[PDB]
Amino acid sequence: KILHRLLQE
Amino acid sequence: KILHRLLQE
Amino acid sequence: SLALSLTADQMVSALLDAEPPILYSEYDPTRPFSEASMMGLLTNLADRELVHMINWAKRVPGFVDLTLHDQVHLLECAWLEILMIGLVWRSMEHPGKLLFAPNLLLDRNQGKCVEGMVEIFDMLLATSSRFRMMNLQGEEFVCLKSIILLNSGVYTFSTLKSLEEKDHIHRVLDKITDTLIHLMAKAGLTLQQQHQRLAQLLLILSHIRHMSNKGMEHLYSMKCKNVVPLSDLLLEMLDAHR
Amino acid sequence: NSLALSLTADQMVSALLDAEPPILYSEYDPFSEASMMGLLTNLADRELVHMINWAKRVPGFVDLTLHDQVHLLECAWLEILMIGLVWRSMEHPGKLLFAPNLLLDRNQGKCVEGMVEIFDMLLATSSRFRMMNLQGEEFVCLKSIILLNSGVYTFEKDHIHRVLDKITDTLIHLMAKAGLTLQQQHQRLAQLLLILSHIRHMSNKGMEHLYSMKCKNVVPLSDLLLEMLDAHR
Ligand SMILES: CCCCOC(=O)c1ccc(O)cc1
Numbered sequence: 001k002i003l004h005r006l007l008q009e
Numbered sequence: 010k011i012l013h014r015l016l017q018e
Numbered sequence: 019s020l021a022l023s024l025t026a027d028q029m030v031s032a033l034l035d036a037e038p039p040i041l042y043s044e045y046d047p048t049r050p051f052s053e054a055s056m057m058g059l060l061t062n063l064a065d066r067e068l069v070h071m072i073n074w075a076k077r078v079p080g081f082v083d084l085t086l087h088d089q090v091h092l093l094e095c096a097w098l099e100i101l102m103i104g105l106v107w108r109s110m111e112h113p114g115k116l117l118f119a120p121n122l123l124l125d126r127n128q129g130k131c132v133e134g135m136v137e138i139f140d141m142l143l144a145t146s147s148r149f150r151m152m153n154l155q156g157e158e159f160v161c162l163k164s165i166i167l168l169n170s171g172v173y174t175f176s177t178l179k180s181l182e183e184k185d186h187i188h189r190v191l192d193k194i195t196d197t198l199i200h201l202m203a204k205a206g207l208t209l210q211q212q213h214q215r216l217a218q219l220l221l222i223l224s225h226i227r228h229m230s231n232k233g234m235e236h237l238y239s240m241k242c243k244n245v246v247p248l249s250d251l252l253l254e255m256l257d258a259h260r
Numbered sequence: 261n262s263l264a265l266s267l268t269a270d271q272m273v274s275a276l277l278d279a280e281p282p283i284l285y286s287e288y289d290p291f292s293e294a295s296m297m298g299l300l301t302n303l304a305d306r307e308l309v310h311m312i313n314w315a316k317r318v319p320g321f322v323d324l325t326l327h328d329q330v331h332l333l334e335c336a337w338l339e340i341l342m343i344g345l346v347w348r349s350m351e352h353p354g355k356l357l358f359a360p361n362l363l364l365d366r367n368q369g370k371c372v373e374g375m376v377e378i379f380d381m382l383l384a385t386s387s388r389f390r391m392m393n394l395q396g397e398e399f400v401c402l403k404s405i406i407l408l409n410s411g412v413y414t415f416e417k418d419h420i421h422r423v424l425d426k427i428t429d430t431l432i433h434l435m436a437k438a439g440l441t442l443q444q445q446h447q448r449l450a451q452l453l454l455i456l457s458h459i460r461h462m463s464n465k466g467m468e469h470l471y472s473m474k475c476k477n478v479v480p481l482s483d484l485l486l487e488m489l490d491a492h493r
């Protein structure tokens with residue numbers, strides 16, 4: 001999910 | 010409204 | 019008004035005195051149940067509880083001070099939250115179960131019966147667990163239930179007149195806050211603990227609002243599916259929410 | 261052990277004040293359903309990127325597992341957008357300040373179907389905040405409380421609850437600091453927290469509206485906004 005990636009970025 | 014009634018009675 | 023003249027102890031007394039009864043369902047462990055009967059038990063029960071709730075509301079300090087139109091509005095907004103909090107309160111001593119009625123204790127499993135009622139069940143159980151974790155007291159419970167009645171529709175109400183209606187509610191609300199604090203102080207909580215617990219209790223109201231909203235949509239869904247019977251009062255309450 | 265719990269009230273306030281995201285602008289084009297909703301979802305999408313980076317800076321939040329961080333934001337995102345909107349609109353009675361260059365009123369809500377109702381709720385919350393003289397420091401505590409609280413029961417938990425208590429302590433701290441009596445402190449705490457119930461209600465209604473709007477395939481929605489929406493099933 002995009003949120004997962006953004007939370008990690 | 011039933012509710013309106015019951016609130017009076 | 020008598021409402022704003024009540025001491026904390028008198029307020030607790032009033033609220034405790036006004037508690038409605040616990041009703042029985044029509045559940046029969048020998049009878050087979052479908053989705054449309056299990057749910058029918060719950061809606062039959064809710065309908066009967068509503069009648070008692072209306073009469074309980076009249077005994078909540080401040081409530082009959084309001085115009086009839088405003089009483090109607092508050093109950094239309096809050097009814098399902100009030101049913102839900104009572105259910106969670108009854109279910110406190112039954113981990114993993116919802117005590118809809120003394121003869122109707124339900125498991126998450128049995129809750130899958132209705133299409134999608136599972137999520138709501140889980141939310142109610144989480145709340146019950148939360149009440150257990152906090153060791154919610156009956157005195158605190160009646161305060162919260164009256165808060166819901168007074169608070170939930172207060173921001174969805176004409177004139178600078180109908181604004182004073184809203185202001186009386188805020189005064190009563192503050193009085194119930196005072197009562198909660200008084201209860202906690204007598205329970206020996208430090209001031210820091212009092213404030214923390216007050217917040218913890220009030221934040222639960224947000225989760226109750228959420229559950230009510232979710233239940234309201236499942237209710238509307240059931241209506242349209244026209245497979246499970248819904249009473250005229252319940253139908254009218256539903257419609258108030260559109 | 262989380263660093264959040266060791267912070268003093270002043271450090272908590274400053275951390276939150278410092279994490280605040282910026283006020284974004286909408287289009288500089290000086291209203292249909294498609295055009296209004298297009299601006300709002302565009303704005304929302306941009307605000308979400310900032311919110312995700314704001315949340316990582318709320319003390320205690322990064323101490324949670326990624327999965328829990330996702331859960332909380334998924335549950336709370338619309339509530340957070342809404343309280344921010346309400347806060348921005350506070351000094352503008354009768355108007356919603358979506359952006360400095362997008363300051364709307366009830367009348368324009370009529371243009372989108374099922375929008376004026378949400379608009380009226382937002383406006384009343386804004387008025388309520390204004391009449392309470394809500395302070396920026398109280399606002400940031402309230403907003404972080406929403407982030408941590410909204411999804412907490414659909415769940416570590418103790419951690420979230422300990423941090424929630426810390427934010428309560430911080431609120432009271434601010435109210436004592438502003439000179440409020442004991443009784444005024446607890447009454448004000450209650451008043452503010454009860455508004456969070458109304459914010460939940462507005463979010464629930466906004467989510468329904470967004471869903472119907474999605475189904476009506478009227479305005480395109482970013483993959484991000486669609487994922488945030490889909491999380492509410
Ligand atoms: C839409 C229904 C969700 C589950 O709750 C109930 O049906 C219900 C019925 C009576 C109560 O006292 C509480 C909940």
Ligand SMILES: CCCCOC(=O)c1ccc(O)cc1
Pocket residue numbers: 300301303304307341342344345358375378466467469470
């Ligand atoms: C779905 C009705 C409008 C809900 O609010 C918004 O879409 C919105 C967008 C950006 C904000 O900062 C706040 C709310």
